[PDB]
Design a protein around this ligand. Structure first.
Ligand SMILES: NC(=[NH2+])c1ccc(N)cc1
Ligand SMILES: [Co+2]
Length: 223
């Protein structure tokens, strides 16, 4: 997160951390007791998801649960066109129990509205190019479709949307991929990509436009 601040511990209970050998590489959103939503470009053969965290130090966070999973379903059209449909559902081995610091969030069924201010959180790089010790939070506003599509032509696709890009230099960044973007308490998008460096004025970040994959997310999680 660029130019944000330490989130209020456990203020985003749907936040899922994805760690590899021993480091964080992505995030996900608990959209169901046994399913974590994330960016297709975060696919692995097996994940080590951390729920209920705030600091990466799992054994320092109470209600925290380091579950495991291996069945991941990337969206059929991911990366066709280049970079598009960047979402993926990861099915957790053992379903988790919604605790005090671990709750799932629902996906917005309506589409981003320009100007609307939202929040995004993650453990990605900071304004100083450094990784944070706790989960970061920042607000960015939805940018209009016109500006988005022209700014990111010809890579822009309807499965994406822009947010931020303001003068305040608030934005996501590397390590926040698959992170959540909440709008009025709904999961509006996932941290997907954007120009580098991050936090450039006039250059918003791109997020997966979840409002567009409700039916798929459903047919998958359920059936
Ligand atoms: N700066 C950004 N909004 C960004 C950087 C890496 C990435 N995967 C996604 C987005
Ligand atoms: Co805590």
């Amino acid at each position: 997160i660029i130019n944000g601040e330490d989130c209020s511990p456990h203020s985003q209970p749907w936040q899922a951390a994805l760690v590899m050998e021993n480091e964080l590489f992505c995030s996900g959103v608990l959209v169901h007791p046994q399913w974590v939503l994330s960016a297709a470009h975060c696919f692995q053969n097996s994940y080590t998801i951390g729920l209920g965290l705030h600091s990466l130090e799992a054994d320092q966070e109470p209600g925290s649960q380091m579950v495991e999973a291996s069945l991941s379903v990337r969206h059929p059209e991911y990366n066709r066109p280049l970079l598009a449909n960047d979402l993926m559902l990861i099915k957790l081995d053992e379903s988790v129990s919604e605790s005090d610091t671990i709750r799932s969030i629902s996906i917005a069924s309506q589409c981003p509205t320009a100007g609307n201010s939202c929040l995004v959180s993650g453990w990605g790089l900071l304004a100083n190019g450094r990784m944070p010790t706790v989960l970061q939070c920042v607000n960015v506003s939805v940018v209009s479709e016109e500006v988005c599509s022209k700014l990111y032509d010809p890579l822009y696709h309807p499965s994406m949307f822009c947010a931020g890009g303001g003068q305040d230099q608030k934005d996501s960044c590397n390590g926040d991929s698959g992170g959540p973007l909440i709008c009025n308490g709904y999961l509006q998008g996932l941290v997907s990509f954007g120009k580098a460096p991050c936090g450039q004025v006039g250059v918003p970040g791109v997020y997966t436009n979840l409002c567009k994959f409700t039916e798929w997310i459903e047919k998958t999680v359920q059936a």
